[PDB]
Amino acid sequence: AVSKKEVLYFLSSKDAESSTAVKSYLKSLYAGAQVEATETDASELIAQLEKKYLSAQVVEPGVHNIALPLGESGSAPVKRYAAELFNLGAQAGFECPFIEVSKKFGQETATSETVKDVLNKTKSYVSADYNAALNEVLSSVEAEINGPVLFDGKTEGFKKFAAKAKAVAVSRGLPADTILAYCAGSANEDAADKVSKEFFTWFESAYTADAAAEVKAIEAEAASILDRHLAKPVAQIRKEQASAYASLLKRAETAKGAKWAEKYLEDVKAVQWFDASVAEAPASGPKVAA
Amino acid sequence: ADAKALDELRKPKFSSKYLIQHVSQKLIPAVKEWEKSYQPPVIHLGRVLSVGDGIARVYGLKSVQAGELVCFDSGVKGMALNLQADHVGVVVFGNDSVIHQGDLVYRTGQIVNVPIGPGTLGRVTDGLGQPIDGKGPLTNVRSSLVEVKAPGIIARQSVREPLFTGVKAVDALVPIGRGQRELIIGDRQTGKTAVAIDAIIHQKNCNEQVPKAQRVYCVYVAVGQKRSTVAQLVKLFTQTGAMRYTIMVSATASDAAPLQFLAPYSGCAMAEYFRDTGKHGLIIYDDLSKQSVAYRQMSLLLRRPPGREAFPGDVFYLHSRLLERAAKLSKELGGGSLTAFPVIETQAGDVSAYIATNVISITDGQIFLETELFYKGIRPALNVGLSVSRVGSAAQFPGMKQVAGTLKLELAQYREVAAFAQFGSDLDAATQYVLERGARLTEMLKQKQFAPIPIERQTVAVYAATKGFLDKVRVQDIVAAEEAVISQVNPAVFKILKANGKITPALDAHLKAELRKVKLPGA
Amino acid sequence: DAGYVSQVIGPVVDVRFDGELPSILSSLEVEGHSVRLVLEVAQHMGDNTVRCIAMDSTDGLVRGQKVVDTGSPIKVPVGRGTLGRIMNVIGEPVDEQGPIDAADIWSIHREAPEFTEQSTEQEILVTGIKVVDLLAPYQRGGKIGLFGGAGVGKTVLIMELINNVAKAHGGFSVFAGVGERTREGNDLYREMIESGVIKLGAERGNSKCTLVYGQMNEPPGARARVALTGLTVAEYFRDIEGQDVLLFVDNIFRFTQANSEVSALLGRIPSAVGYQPTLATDLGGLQERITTTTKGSITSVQAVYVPADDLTDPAPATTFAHLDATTVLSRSIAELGIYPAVDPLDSTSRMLNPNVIGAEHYNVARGVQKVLQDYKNLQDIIAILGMDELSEEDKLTVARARKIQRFLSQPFQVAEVFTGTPGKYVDLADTISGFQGVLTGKYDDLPEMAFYMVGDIKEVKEKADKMAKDIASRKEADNKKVSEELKDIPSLDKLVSEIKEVVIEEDDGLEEDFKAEALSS
Ligand SMILES: Nc1ncnc2c1ncn2[C@@H]1O[C@H](COP(=O)(O)OP(=O)(O)OP(=O)(O)O)[C@@H](O)[C@H]1O
Numbered sequence A: 001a002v003s004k005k006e007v008l009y010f011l012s013s014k015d016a017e018s019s020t021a022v023k024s025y026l027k028s029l030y031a032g033a034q035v036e037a038t039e040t041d042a043s044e045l046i047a048q049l050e051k052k053y054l055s056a057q058v059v060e061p062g063v064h065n066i067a068l069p070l071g072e073s074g075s076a077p078v079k080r081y082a083a084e085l086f087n088l089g090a091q092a093g094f095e096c097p098f099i100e101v102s103k104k105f106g107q108e109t110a111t112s113e114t115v116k117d118v119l120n121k122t123k124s125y126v127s128a129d130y131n132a133a134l135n136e137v138l139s140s141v142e143a144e145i146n147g148p149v150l151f152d153g154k155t156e157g158f159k160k161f162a163a164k165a166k167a168v169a170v171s172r173g174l175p176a177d178t179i180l181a182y183c184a185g186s187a188n189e190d191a192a193d194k195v196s197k198e199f200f201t202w203f204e205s206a207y208t209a210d211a212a213a214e215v216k217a218i219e220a221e222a223a224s225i226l227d228r229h230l231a232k233p234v235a236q237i238r239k240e241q242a243s244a245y246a247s248l249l250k251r252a253e254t255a256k257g258a259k260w261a262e263k264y265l266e267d268v269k270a271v272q273w274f275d276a277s278v279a280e281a282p283a284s285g286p287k288v289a290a
Numbered sequence B: 001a002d003a004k005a006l007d008e009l010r011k012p013k014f015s016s017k018y019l020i021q022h023v024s025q026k027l028i029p030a031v032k033e034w035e036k037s038y039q040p041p042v043i044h045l046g047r048v049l050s051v052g053d054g055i056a057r058v059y060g061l062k063s064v065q066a067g068e069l070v071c072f073d074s075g076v077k078g079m080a081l082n083l084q085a086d087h088v089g090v091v092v093f094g095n096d097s098v099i100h101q102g103d104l105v106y107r108t109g110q111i112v113n114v115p116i117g118p119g120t121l122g123r124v125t126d127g128l129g130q131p132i133d134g135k136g137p138l139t140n141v142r143s144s145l146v147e148v149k150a151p152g153i154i155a156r157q158s159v160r161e162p163l164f165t166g167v168k169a170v171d172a173l174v175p176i177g178r179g180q181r182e183l184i185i186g187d188r189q190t191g192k193t194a195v196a197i198d199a200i201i202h203q204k205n206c207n208e209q210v211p212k213a214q215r216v217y218c219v220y221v222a223v224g225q226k227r228s229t230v231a232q233l234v235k236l237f238t239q240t241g242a243m244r245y246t247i248m249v250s251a252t253a254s255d256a257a258p259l260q261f262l263a264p265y266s267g268c269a270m271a272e273y274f275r276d277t278g279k280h281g282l283i284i285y286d287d288l289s290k291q292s293v294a295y296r297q298m299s300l301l302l303r304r305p306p307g308r309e310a311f312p313g314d315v316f317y318l319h320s321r322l323l324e325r326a327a328k329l330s331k332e333l334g335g336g337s338l339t340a341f342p343v344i345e346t347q348a349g350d351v352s353a354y355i356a357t358n359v360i361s362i363t364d365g366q367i368f369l370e371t372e373l374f375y376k377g378i379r380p381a382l383n384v385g386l387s388v389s390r391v392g393s394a395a396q397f398p399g400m401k402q403v404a405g406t407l408k409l410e411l412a413q414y415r416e417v418a419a420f421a422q423f424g425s426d427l428d429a430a431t432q433y434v435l436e437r438g439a440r441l442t443e444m445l446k447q448k449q450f451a452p453i454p455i456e457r458q459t460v461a462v463y464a465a466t467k468g469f470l471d472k473v474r475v476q477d478i479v480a481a482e483e484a485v486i487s488q489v490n491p492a493v494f495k496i497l498k499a500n501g502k503i504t505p506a507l508d509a510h511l512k513a514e515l516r517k518v519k520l521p522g523a
Numbered sequence C: 001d002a003g004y005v006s007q008v009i010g011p012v013v014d015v016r017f018d019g020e021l022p023s024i025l026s027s028l029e030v031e032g033h034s035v036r037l038v039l040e041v042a043q044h045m046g047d048n049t050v051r052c053i054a055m056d057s058t059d060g061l062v063r064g065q066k067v068v069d070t071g072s073p074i075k076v077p078v079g080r081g082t083l084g085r086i087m088n089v090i091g092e093p094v095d096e097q098g099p100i101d102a103a104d105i106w107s108i109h110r111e112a113p114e115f116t117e118q119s120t121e122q123e124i125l126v127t128g129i130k131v132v133d134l135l136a137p138y139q140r141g142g143k144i145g146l147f148g149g150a151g152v153g154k155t156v157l158i159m160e161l162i163n164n165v166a167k168a169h170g171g172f173s174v175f176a177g178v179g180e181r182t183r184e185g186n187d188l189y190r191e192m193i194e195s196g197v198i199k200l201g202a203e204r205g206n207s208k209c210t211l212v213y214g215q216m217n218e219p220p221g222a223r224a225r226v227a228l229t230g231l232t233v234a235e236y237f238r239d240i241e242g243q244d245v246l247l248f249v250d251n252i253f254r255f256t257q258a259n260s261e262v263s264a265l266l267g268r269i270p271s272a273v274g275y276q277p278t279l280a281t282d283l284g285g286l287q288e289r290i291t292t293t294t295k296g297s298i299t300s301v302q303a304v305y306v307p308a309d310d311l312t313d314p315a316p317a318t319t320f321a322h323l324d325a326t327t328v329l330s331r332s333i334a335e336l337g338i339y340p341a342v343d344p345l346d347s348t349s350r351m352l353n354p355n356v357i358g359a360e361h362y363n364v365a366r367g368v369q370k371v372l373q374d375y376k377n378l379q380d381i382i383a384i385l386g387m388d389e390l391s392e393e394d395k396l397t398v399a400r401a402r403k404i405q406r407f408l409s410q411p412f413q414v415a416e417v418f419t420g421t422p423g424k425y426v427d428l429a430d431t432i433s434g435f436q437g438v439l440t441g442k443y444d445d446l447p448e449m450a451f452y453m454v455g456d457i458k459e460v461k462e463k464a465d466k467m468a469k470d471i472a473s474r475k476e477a478d479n480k481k482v483s484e485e486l487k488d489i490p491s492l493d494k495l496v497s498e499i500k501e502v503v504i505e506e507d508d509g510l511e512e513d514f515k516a517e518a519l520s521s
């Protein structure tokens, strides 16, 4: 059963087991059942924890439903993969990645007086090749001022840092000024449109490069696992995989009464059905009652 | 069965989705419970008056308990040890260079505790719980105090099950029961650690063969050692496989003196988990003589007045608090057990020292290793005339109770006759027999470094040495004959003596028939 | 009104009172502690503060914790309601069997009785142990010491004394376990359940022993006062009910050691080897209460640990002056296998006068001692030369003394677990007759190993003819059992088919048991 915070997150979900639970709930509602009350409770930390653990239940069947574009030619499968991850994030209740990680930056730095604690507390979300390049520039302006560079904006002890940090940002490879002009906006729509159309070219470059780096790392991990696997003899392979499969079955069979254990063994039985159904008619595929 | 659906076949199968849902179902009613009952408790402060030598005298902290963990504002912890009218004496768990005069000390409210449980198995921790092997936090673990009162009279039962060390100089002559504490005392580089490492590695060999209830989980407490010395033991316990059952509590020589004083208590608390929940533990405190030097350092820097050699008065109570926690519990409490092996290093074979005579007085047995026996070839260098076991014949192997009674009866006769016959006066054809037979037994109890012999191959070898089968075999290859006595004798006669646990009348007549069809060297 | 904790340094607690300080040796009780913590006032430190020692651990004590004066010393239940129970130092029952009935609870601090109420009467306590009954005979009502280092047999000898003189005698017994192992206290308790001396439940009133236990896990305050609690139970049985008490005190050394462990924290500059300046007076104040008075009698058997087989250490050397019979057990006698390892020369008694135990006992004991002494004077030349010159009388001295040395050994009824042997009770006349036989050349026809671990002189003859029958019949199995046996020894695969397999799990079940207990409690 769903707990009505379960089902409000699954209305915009499009995976299978979320949609059948939504449809069973609505077919319960049509047959003379009332909705329960929505909790106007659970203050901000519990609300954030609930949306964190409810976004993951929308993301986790959605990540498994997205085909990786491994071993592909052209950037259009990488753009398919990144657009599918974008759509899954939007279905799970996230915003655009830019808005969401900017919100994470502003959440981690509400206490920030200096740029040193900015560059040290957002270290988990900025790459080391950029955090070190901004740390050395903060140290270069700190050697000039001989006073701590503070996080003010109007203080030009900050601006002597920021004019070189923009140079670091343009030496990384990313156009900082069109990003600042996009998230600063403009008055007339015709002059903000021409810079949004440049920001979106940067944005497509950036998310395609991130998805491509993830795909190339998955390709390298698959090739490493295969070349370590093709060095074994066959009986070693069979007993290793059979031992791992047997241990992973017994870890879900010693779990009795947990929902994930029954779902695990039901999916094992569904895989065995798939194997039997393609053994029944191998030219037609599995039997789908349409 | 056939033709399921389309909407049933669109599901991704082994996604998480329900482990995530299980965590969010067990978590949110538990964290609304935490937030609805949340008072941010009043933290009592204290100022550092002075600091130096790992002691910080703290002003204030008026509600602090004796033995309570305190926290400095540098992040380094402490323990309030002597509460005085004007200040608190706080031993510092780490480097005291980060503490200044006037620093703030907060009391944590809690007495010193370590994480115990089965999540400590496999891991290498420091003197209080925190793992130093680089494998993240201790999952599946639970905190409990390091200073627990030992079980009283009614909480015990008599030590009857045997603890097999795999060292036949020990398992024959000074046998060890489960719940018995046994001192491994010796001089500087004898085989003290090697006796204790062989007792741990042997429990790995027995745990694969016994049922799950009678498995012994070992804890090695390394106090005051090198950090690379204990890295050689984690490498040895990994490539043997004993690290599956072993916890290592490592308070090395660079750790602070309160971390080495407290590490035997942390290791005893990690091993008391298995005692209290019906399993069996084996704790090894390597150099309790290095724990007492760490205790003497704090006691002399807390200005407690020195006694013998410089030691505090309560240094007997230091070790008897700790070794009395090794017990065999009653069956009402689970039948669990904890077997201790304190190690004490003497200086020149002088067991009359202060810390040496304390632990000799506490523990049941004693495994006295001699440096002159070490170099004569006798390794393990066990002084069979001084090594005791107070449990004795109560908890040894019944198959070797009837063989190693004769073994110590002959080796007692070997000792005084060799004191006379090394002068070279005269020999008597039966005095000639006892110093020729006792040389067969002395070479029989020798052993290699990291090969514990199970219990049945030990008792067959002392059988073949005491039932005359190793007479007229030359003394140089009795250490080389007895691999043939174990390999050429049938491997299914070892199963019967393991299953019976005793030499039946239908087995001595079969085994001594099998000790004749062996090809002995020299002969 | 009440006082408050001012200072906690180890087991020594300073309590500050604002008016009406408690007396010295008065017990104070900390309220708000997890366990019942009893402090005992040791001294007045001077500015309205007293210095106390704690009877339990001081971990968890806070400066300013409230402390209640009880107005009296530590008071423990005494009487017939304690027979069959195990008590603490502070009288709490630790056997998990209800409360203690407590007819007339009593303070544990007393003066020694007087000089006028002493009894100067000496009668022998026959123990069954022939070295004890022969060479250092115990006085029925006097103080007995058992000396020795670690592992010589003080606990085995005191257990043999317990089940040899305590199983049926005219009064009651009190065992005071002072600072020894908890394992052997449990072993003693279970052995007295099986021996019927302590009865549980409804027949608790027919019990003949009180256990008072102060073992090694306890702090030095508790191990210093538990001997006084066992003394107070015995002093009730002697002073009020007027009957004979046996008082077995395992390791009276631990009383002195426990007083030494707190001593320099009490503000005393250290004395010799490491001990307190008040070692002799603390020991004397304990030992002078264990007296036969005109009211009753207390026969005390105290084990004394010597620290490194060293009888010159001040803690045994102080207590040597308090004992009527000092049985000294030696390491050298124990490494020979002579058990009980009683040093025959070093063990003395005040019952070894000829006008007390007769001349036929006195002269055989002194003759046995003289033969064992000139054997020791010969033994430095036997180990070098080897009995090639020894004059046909000193050879007879060596032979008779080896027979005497074996004949002092005796299998104990409590050491059947250890070696193999059923235990022997030897009467006094039997060991007098036996040692007078061995001393006067009467048993030179026997082997000297027929004297080893036997009851009396007729069991020497019963073992000598057994040895002859045995070693003259070694030649019985050199012709058979090598082939063509009775097939009562079946084949090996048949023997391993009877080995019914134990299931081995290969899971260790630990992480499920941990979460099972985490969902429990
Ligand atoms: N049974 C044995 N057979 C052969 N060699 C041994 C045996 N036991 C120990 N050794 C050798 O003796 C040396 C000392 O052993 P061990 O490390 O046990 O010394 P120790 O008594 O622990 O002294 P320390 O604590 O100072 O190291 C080791 O290098 C080991 O190789």
Ligand SMILES: Nc1ncnc2c1ncn2[C@@H]1O[C@H](COP(=O)(O)OP(=O)(O)O)[C@@H](O)[C@H]1O
Pocket (backbone or CB within 6 Å): B388, B389, B390, B391, B392, C148, C149, C150, C151, C152, C153, C154, C155, C156, C157, C339, C340, C341, C412, C415, C418, C419
């Ligand atoms: N009468 C005896 N017979 C056989 N063995 C003995 C005897 N007395 C002592 N022992 C041996 O000496 C060991 C230690 O004696 P124990 O009772 O512990 O003396 P202590 O308490 O003085 O150390 C015992 O385990 C036992 O094996």
Ligand SMILES: [Mg+2]
Pocket (backbone or CB within 6 Å): B192, B193
């Ligand atoms: Mg070592």
Ligand SMILES: [Mg+2]
Pocket (backbone or CB within 6 Å): C154, C155, C180, C250
């Ligand atoms: Mg003892």
